[PDB]
Design an enzyme around this catalytic site. Structure first.
Site, PDB file in Angstrom:
ATOM      1  N   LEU A  59      20.296 -32.792   4.580  1.00  0.00           N
ATOM      2  CA  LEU A  59      20.843 -32.191   3.373  1.00  0.00           C
ATOM      3  C   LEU A  59      22.295 -32.582   3.161  1.00  0.00           C
ATOM      4  O   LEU A  59      22.702 -32.849   1.978  1.00  0.00           O
ATOM      5  CB  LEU A  59      20.753 -30.680   3.454  1.00  0.00           C
ATOM      6  N   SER A  60      23.079 -32.532   4.223  1.00  0.00           N
ATOM      7  CA  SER A  60      24.518 -32.825   4.207  1.00  0.00           C
ATOM      8  C   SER A  60      24.777 -34.313   4.434  1.00  0.00           C
ATOM      9  O   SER A  60      23.955 -35.044   4.938  1.00  0.00           O
ATOM     10  CB  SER A  60      25.222 -32.056   5.334  1.00  0.00           C
TER      11      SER A  60
ATOM     12  N   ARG B  54      28.433 -36.854  14.594  1.00  0.00           N
ATOM     13  CA  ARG B  54      27.271 -36.749  13.678  1.00  0.00           C
ATOM     14  C   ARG B  54      26.951 -38.093  13.036  1.00  0.00           C
ATOM     15  O   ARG B  54      25.967 -38.183  12.275  1.00  0.00           O
ATOM     16  CB  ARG B  54      27.489 -35.667  12.625  1.00  0.00           C
TER      17      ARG B  54
ATOM     18  N   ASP C 202      11.264 -41.239  21.183  1.00  0.00           N
ATOM     19  CA  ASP C 202      10.195 -41.836  21.964  1.00  0.00           C
ATOM     20  C   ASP C 202       8.831 -41.212  21.543  1.00  0.00           C
ATOM     21  O   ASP C 202       7.802 -41.907  21.648  1.00  0.00           O
ATOM     22  CB  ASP C 202      10.472 -41.684  23.455  1.00  0.00           C
TER      23      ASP C 202
ATOM     24  N   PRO D 157      16.509 -27.684  14.422  1.00  0.00           N
ATOM     25  CA  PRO D 157      17.128 -26.394  14.676  1.00  0.00           C
ATOM     26  C   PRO D 157      18.067 -25.973  13.542  1.00  0.00           C
ATOM     27  O   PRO D 157      18.671 -26.795  12.835  1.00  0.00           O
ATOM     28  CB  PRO D 157      17.891 -26.535  15.972  1.00  0.00           C
ATOM     29  N   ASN D 158      18.194 -24.649  13.394  1.00  0.00           N
ATOM     30  CA  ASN D 158      19.198 -24.019  12.504  1.00  0.00           C
ATOM     31  C   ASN D 158      18.849 -24.109  11.020  1.00  0.00           C
ATOM     32  O   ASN D 158      19.447 -23.362  10.232  1.00  0.00           O
ATOM     33  CB  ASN D 158      20.636 -24.524  12.775  1.00  0.00           C
TER      34      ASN D 158
ATOM     35  N   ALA E  30      20.520 -30.958  14.356  1.00  0.00           N
ATOM     36  CA  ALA E  30      21.367 -31.318  15.524  1.00  0.00           C
ATOM     37  C   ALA E  30      20.667 -32.278  16.468  1.00  0.00           C
ATOM     38  O   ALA E  30      21.357 -33.057  17.133  1.00  0.00           O
ATOM     39  CB  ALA E  30      21.796 -30.065  16.273  1.00  0.00           C
TER      40      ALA E  30
ATOM     41  N   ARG F 263      23.548 -16.934   4.858  1.00  0.00           N
ATOM     42  CA  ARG F 263      24.948 -16.459   4.989  1.00  0.00           C
ATOM     43  C   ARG F 263      25.723 -16.824   3.727  1.00  0.00           C
ATOM     44  O   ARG F 263      25.659 -17.966   3.300  1.00  0.00           O
ATOM     45  CB  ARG F 263      25.591 -17.026   6.254  1.00  0.00           C
TER      46      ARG F 263
ATOM     47  N   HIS G 117      21.303 -36.299  16.903  1.00  0.00           N
ATOM     48  CA  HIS G 117      22.402 -36.924  17.654  1.00  0.00           C
ATOM     49  C   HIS G 117      22.131 -36.856  19.146  1.00  0.00           C
ATOM     50  O   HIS G 117      22.895 -37.530  19.938  1.00  0.00           O
ATOM     51  CB  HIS G 117      23.710 -36.208  17.338  1.00  0.00           C
TER      52      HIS G 117
ATOM     53  N   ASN H 126      13.820 -34.037   9.254  1.00  0.00           N
ATOM     54  CA  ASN H 126      15.244 -33.668   9.319  1.00  0.00           C
ATOM     55  C   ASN H 126      15.428 -33.122  10.708  1.00  0.00           C
ATOM     56  O   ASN H 126      15.170 -31.905  10.907  1.00  0.00           O
ATOM     57  CB  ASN H 126      15.638 -32.664   8.248  1.00  0.00           C
TER      58      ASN H 126
ATOM     59  N   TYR I 212      27.496 -20.890   0.073  1.00  0.00           N
ATOM     60  CA  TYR I 212      26.756 -22.025   0.694  1.00  0.00           C
ATOM     61  C   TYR I 212      25.401 -22.271   0.005  1.00  0.00           C
ATOM     62  O   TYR I 212      24.767 -23.281   0.337  1.00  0.00           O
ATOM     63  CB  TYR I 212      26.581 -21.770   2.192  1.00  0.00           C
TER      64      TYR I 212
ATOM     65  N   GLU J 224      13.972 -40.317   7.702  1.00  0.00           N
ATOM     66  CA  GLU J 224      14.957 -39.340   8.194  1.00  0.00           C
ATOM     67  C   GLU J 224      15.714 -38.804   6.991  1.00  0.00           C
ATOM     68  O   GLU J 224      16.256 -39.612   6.156  1.00  0.00           O
ATOM     69  CB  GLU J 224      15.900 -40.031   9.172  1.00  0.00           C
TER      70      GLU J 224
END
Lengths: 152, 152, 151, 151, 152, 149, 148, 148, 149, 149, 148, 151
Positions: I104-105, I114, I90, I13-14, I80, I21, I83, I77, I26, I101
Site C-alpha cells: 500500500l505504502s 524497507r 523459498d 503481519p499488521n 514486514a 487507529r 524484508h 503483500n 490514516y 508483490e
C-alpha cells in the site's frame, strides 16, 4: 645475570624482491645490499651468544618449508615477508603451526604507501612490528628478541 | 627514420594455466596453443628488429626471478599474469624494482567475469591494458611497445 | 580490397575528445582527433572496411547514432570518454541494437581517479583497450576485422 | 659525546601513559614512565643527544609543545596513545612544524580492537614501532641518530 | 547394480601446512598424521574399486601442475587447499581448465575462525564443501564422489 | 588602471525555475535578477561578465570549450550536474580556466547523494548555502586572484 | 544601524599561519587577517570579537559564553571540523547562526577531511578562497541580520 | 467530470520497443502502447499528452513547461532513472504529482538498476508488468484527482 | 467463454490493523473492505479469489504449499516479512506459481531497511505506493497474463 | 549496617546547558538540580556521591586517574565524547572501576554517528532515553552490584 | 492514583533463564523476575500483565490486543530485537509507548546484536543491568504516566 | 548394537524441506524427506543410535524442540533451510541448551545468491556440510558417532 647465557638460535626470513637491495640507482635508493645487512646482523648477534641463520627467497614455498624445518630447533624468527605480508595466509599458518615467536620488519613505511599495503596477515600474531626505519629495523628486532628470551 | 633501428629486446611473460590453451574441447574453445601464439609473435617481432623472448609458468617464482634477470637487459615486457593479476603483489614489486615498462594483456574480458577479476595489481603501473581480444592482444602490445620505444 | 565482403564499421567518440591536440601541444601531444580518424579511415579502406565516425559532446547524438546503426553497421569502436562512467543510456542503446563493440581509451583509466575505474560498457564489450594512445583505435579495427572474417 | 653536532630530540607521550607501573604491577609490569624516560635520557646523553620530554592527558599541551619545538628540535619520538586514532589536530601540528618523527606504541595495536588499527600519524611518520614495549623508544632514538648523522 | 563396476580414478590434493598434522602437542591437537589419514582413505577406496592417488604440497605450483596432469586421466578430485583456499585464483582456474568435478574439505570449521577464512575461491564451483569434521571429512567426500559417479 | 577581466558564469539545470513557484515561501528573486545585479557589480570593477544557464549538459560543455583562451575565470553552479557530470569536470580540466563552484543551498544539509561533487576537488574553492550572494563572493575572489589584491 | 556583535572562532594550528617558509606557503598571519576583518566589520557597525585556540574546551566555553550576547558566529574549526561532536553540540545548544570557513579547499585534500560535524547545521560553508572567506562570511552575516 | 490533463514521459531507448527480434522480445511498439493509452484516457475525459526522448534536456524542459498546465505525470525514465538528479529536481521544482513506471522488473536485473532518483518522491512505482503498467498509473491518477 | 482462474491473495503481519487507529488521519478502509471489493471485481471476470491474512509466517508458508497445483496466481503483500523472510521466497519458488508483490505504502520513501525485498526479483512485478488500488492492478495483470489479453 | 559506597558521577561537554534555552520547550531542570537530587538519594543509602561535569576532556581523564583505589563505582554521561574519546575508554580501563553509561536522550533515535560508543562494550550496562531518572537507575544498579542485593 | 495497565513482553529463549549451570550463569528464573516485578507494580497501583514466547506471532497478536487497553509496554524481544520488523510495525500500529530492556550488554556481544529494530522508536533502552532493568523500565513508565 | 552406550540424536529440518520429491521429480529428484529420514533412522539404529526427527515450517516448533532436548539428547543434526540466514533465535536456542550440532544443507549455498552465504549457525556448529544432497545427513550421523564414542 651472573651466569653464562644459553645460546639463542634465531632465524631471519626475507621475502621476494629484497635481493634487489642496492642494485638500482644506488646514488638515489642506497648502496647497502641484503648480504651487507645480514653480515652485520650475524656479527651483532654473535657478540650476544646468538647464532643467527638467514634465508631470503622469491619462492613462498622455500619460506614455508624453512619455517617447518625450524620446529623445535629455532627460538625466535625475524621476518620481512615483503609483498607476501599482504597475500600469504600460508606463511601465517606455518608460523602458527610451529609456535615460534616472531617480529615483523619492513624497510619501508607501509602506512605511507598504497592502501593494500596497510593490511598484514602476520601483524596481529607477531610480538610486534617495525616499519620504515630501514636496515636498522632488523637490529631493533634482534635486540627485542634477546630481551624477550633472556628477560632483560 | 632514415637510419637503421637499434634492436629492441622484449620479454613476454605468461602466468598460470595458459599452457592449457587449445587442449580442452578445441571445436568449442579454440585450437590455437600458446606455443602457436608465441611462434607467430616472435616472427612478427623479428621483422621489426625486435628480439622477443618468452616464459610461461605456473610457478610465481619463475616469473619473479625472470623479471629480476631482465634488469638492464630487456627494453620492454608484455605480461599476461593470468590468475596472478588479482593476487600477486610480489609480481608488481618485481616490475617496479627493475623499472622496465610493460603492457598487461588478457585473452578474456576480465570485466565480463566475476567481480574478483576486476582488480589488477598491475593495471595502474602498466603503460596500458588490453583485454578480451584473444591472441591478437599480444600483437597489439608488441605494436604499442615498438612505437613507444622508437617514437613512431 | 576485393575477395572479402565489405565491413561497415562505426567509430563513436564521446565528450572532450574534440580538444585533442589543442592545449599545450608541446606537452600533451600535437595529434588531433581529425588526424586519428583520417589515418584510421585509410587503414580501414585498405582492408575493405567502410569506416564512419561521429564525435559529440551530446549524449543524445551518440545514442541516436547507435539506434540508426541497427541492421546497417557490423561493428562499433567506442571511446565514450567521461560517459563511460555515467551513461547507462549508452549501455542500453548498444544492448538494444545488438552490434558487437570494443571500448577504447587513450589514457590508462586504472592509473587515474577511482571513479574512472568503473565502466557501464566494459562488461558487455567484446574487449577493452586503455592507455595505448591513438593506436588503440587501430588495434580495435584489427580485432573487429579478425572477428568478422574469422582470421 | 664530542666530535658530533648535538641533536635536540623531543619525546611526547599521550594520555594514560602516566599510569604505567601503577596497577597490578606483578601482572602488567613494574616499570614506570619515569623509569623509561630516565633510562632513555641517559642513553641519549652518551651520544650527544639532549632529550626533552612531555607526557600529558591534555591534547592541547602536546599540540602547543610541538608548536614550541619549531626551529628548536631536530626530531620527535611520539607515543600518542589513544590520540593516535582520534587527533587530526596532532597530525596537523606535526605537519605544520615539519620536524621528522617516529611513532611508538608499547602494545601491538594490530592485535587489539579494529579501531586501533588506524593512525592519523603513521602515514607521515618516518616509521612506526609497535608491540616491543619500552625498548621501542630506544629503537626510535637509535633510528633518529642514524638518520640525522647519516650513520 | 548387477554388473562389475568400472574403476574410478580419484586424486586427493592437500595444501600447505597439512604435513604438520600430528607433530605439535599431540596429547592436545591429536596424534593422527596426514600419511595415516591417506593410508586409511586409500584402503577404504580400494574396497570400492577406486584407485586413489594423493599429493600434499606447500608449493602452489605442484598442486596446479598435478591438476593439469589429471586432465582426461582422473574422474574426481578431493581437495583441502588449506591456506590457499582464501588466496589462490590460480587453483580455481586449474580446476575449471581441466573440468574435473571436486569436493572441498577442511579439517577445521573455517566459519568459526577469522573472517578472512570465510571466503573460498573454490566453494562456488565445488560439488560441495565439508568443514569442521576432522579427518572423516575426506571419507565423506569419497563416499559422495562414488555415489555421484555411479548414480548410487 | 586595471586590465579588463572576462568572466563567464555558468548555471546548470532547473535554476531557470528560481522565483517561480510559491514566491511567498521559496523567494521572489529570479535568476535574471541575480545575473543582472552581478553583471552591474562586475562592470563597476572593469569585469565583463557573460552568462549561460542551461538544462542541456552539452550547452555547458560546448560553452566551456568555446571559452578557451577567451575567458579569464569561470563561476559555475552546475546544480544537479554537480553530482553526475564527469564530462563537465573534464571540459574544465581540458580548457584550464580557474573556476569557483557555487550553490545557493547548503548541499551538506540535503540528501547524501548531494554531498559529492565532480568539481569540488579541482575548483579554486566552493561556496554553498549563502544564497545569491555566493555569486558575488565568487566574483570578489576571482578579481582578487587575477589582480593579486 | 543597530550594532551587530559577531564572534570569530579559529581552531588548532591556525596560529602557525605565515610562520613556515613564507615565500612558499604565504606571509599573512592570523593576526593580520583578524586585524583587517575587525576593521572591515567596524566600518559597518559590527563589533567583531575573536578567539583562536588549540584547546577544544576554550572554543566550547567561548560558545557557551556567547549565549544571548552574540548575533552570529564565523568558525574555522580547522582539524576539529572532522573530529569534534562536542563543538557541534555547543553550537546547537546556544542556537546562534554560524558560517563555516576554511582557508584551504578541503575537497582537494585527504578523504577524512571531506566530512564536517558542522556543515549540515551551518548557514553555509566557504572553502578554498583563502583569507577572503572570512570577509565573505562577514558580508553574509550582515545581509542576513539586517535583511540587505 | 472536469477534464484532467496528464503528461506521459518516456526516456531513452524506449523508441526501440518492438524493433529487434519481435518473435523473442515482443511486437508491441511504443506508439502502439501510447495510442491505446491515449484512447483509454479520452474515454474518461483525460487529455493525455506524450513525449519520448533520448535527450535528457527534452524531458527536463517538458516538465518545466508542464507547470500550472498539467495535473499529473506518468514517467518511465528508462536508463535515466538511475542517473538523472536533474530529472528529480525538475519534478520537485514544478510540484506535479507523478508515478514511476517500468516495463521490466528492475529488481531482477543488475544491482545498479535497483536505485532510482525518483522512487522516493513518486506517488508510487510500478515495475515488471509490461505495457499495462501505464494503464494502472493512469487509473491511479484518475482516482487520486477525482477522489474515486 | 473463459476458463475460471483461481487466485490467492496473501497478506502479511499488521495489515489486520488497517482502518483501526485515528481513521480521520490514516484512513477508514479496512482489509476486509479491500478484500470484499477485490473479490467482487474478480468474480465479474470469472476469477475465484481466495484470501489469507496472518501475523504468523508459518500460516503464509503452509498456505503457499497447499496452493500447489490448485492456484493459478498469487498476489502477496508480505508487509514486514518482505524484508526478513527467506522462507517465504523459498515457498513461492518451491510451488512455482507466478505472483505479484504489492504494498500500500511507498517503501522507497521509508527507512532504508524497507528498500530491499526477498521477493521482488522473482515476482512477475511489484506495485507500491498506490494504496488499495494496487491489489486491483495486480488482479488485472494476472488476468491479462493468464488469458494473454 | 552497610559499608559506605563512594560513587563518582562524571558528565561530559554541553550538559552544563541543561535547563537554559527555551525552558518551556526543552525543560527547566538544570544539571545542578539533577545532581542535588541524586546526591540526596545516594546519601539515604549510605553512598557518598561526588560529581564533576566538564567541557574539558582532560579534566574527566584526570578525575578518573585520581579515582584509582578511592572510588567504588562510576556513573558517566560522556555526552559528545561518547562517540569520539578513545582516551576516556583507556582511562576507565586503566583504573579498573566498574561503570554505567547514561544518556538523557535516546541516541538510537538521533543521527547515525551517535549510535556508536567507545564505552558501551566495557560498561556494566547502558541506559538511554529515560531522562534524568537514568542517573537514579544507574545508582540503584551500582548499589545492588556492590552489595549483592 | 488512577490504575496503570502495563504489559511486559519477553521474546525467545528467556524461558531458559536459571536452567543451565545455575552456579555459573545464575539461579533466577524468568518466573522469579516477573513475580517480583508484578508485586513491585501492584504496590504502586499498576496492574502488570506478562507474556513470554518463542512464537513471534504470539507477541505480535498480544500487542494488537493491547490497543486501547494497555498504557505502557516493557519489551525484551531477545533474538527478535535484531530480526523482527513485524514487531516494530505492531508497536507503531497500536501507538503505545514502550521501553526496550535486555538483561545482557548487547554492545559487548557480536556485532549483529548491536542493531535493534525497536531502539529508535522506544522511549528508551536499558541493557546489561540484569533483572533490575525491568524495574527501572517500570519506574520510568510510572513517572511518565503520572508526571512524577 | 550392544557394547556401546546408546546415543540419543535429534534431526531438525527447517521450512520447505517437506516439498522434497514433490515438484517435477524427473528434474529435481524423486527422494522425499520421509525417504531420507527412514533410511537415516535405520542406519542410526544399527550403531545403537536412537534417532528422533522434526521438520517444520514453524520457527517456534524448532526452538521449542531444542529447548525440550536439554539433558535428553546427545547431538543434533540440523538443516535450518531458509532460517539459516535469518534466525538468531535458533542460534540462541542451541547455545542455551549446549548440545553439539552439525549443520547440513542439501544444496551448495556458496553457488547460490550472496544472502545464502551467511549462516547464524555455522560459527558455533561443530562443522558444516553443503552441496552433497541427502548423503550429508548420513555424513553428519557418522561424524556425531565418532565424536561421542572417540572412534
Amino acid at each position: 645475570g651472573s651466569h653464562m647465557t644459553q645460546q639463542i638460535k634465531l632465524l631471519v626470513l626475507n621475502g621476494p624482491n629484497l635481493n634487489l637491495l642496492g642494485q638500482r640507482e644506488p646514488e638515489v635508493y642506497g648502496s647497502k645490499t641484503l648480504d651487507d645487512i645480514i653480515k652485520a646482523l650475524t656479527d651483532e648477534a654473535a657478540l650476544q651468544n646468538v647464532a643467527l641463520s638467514h634465508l631470503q627467497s622469491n619462492r613462498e614455498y622455500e619460506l614455508i618449508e624453512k619455517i617447518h624445518d625450524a620446529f623445535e630447533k629455532i627460538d625466535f624468527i625475524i621476518i620481512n615477508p615483503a609483498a607476501f605480508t599482504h597475500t600469504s595466509v600460508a606463511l601465517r599458518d606455518a608460523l602458527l603451526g610451529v609456535n615460534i615467536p616472531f617480529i615483523e620488519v619492513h624497510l619501508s613505511n607501509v602506512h605511507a604507501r598504497e592502501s593494500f599495503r596497510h593490511h598484514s596477515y602476520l601483524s596481529d600474531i607477531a610480538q610486534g612490528v617495525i616499519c620504515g626505519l630501514g636496515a636498522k629495523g632488523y637490529s631493533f628486532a634482534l635486540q627485542s628478541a634477546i630481551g624477550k628470551l633472556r628477560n632483560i
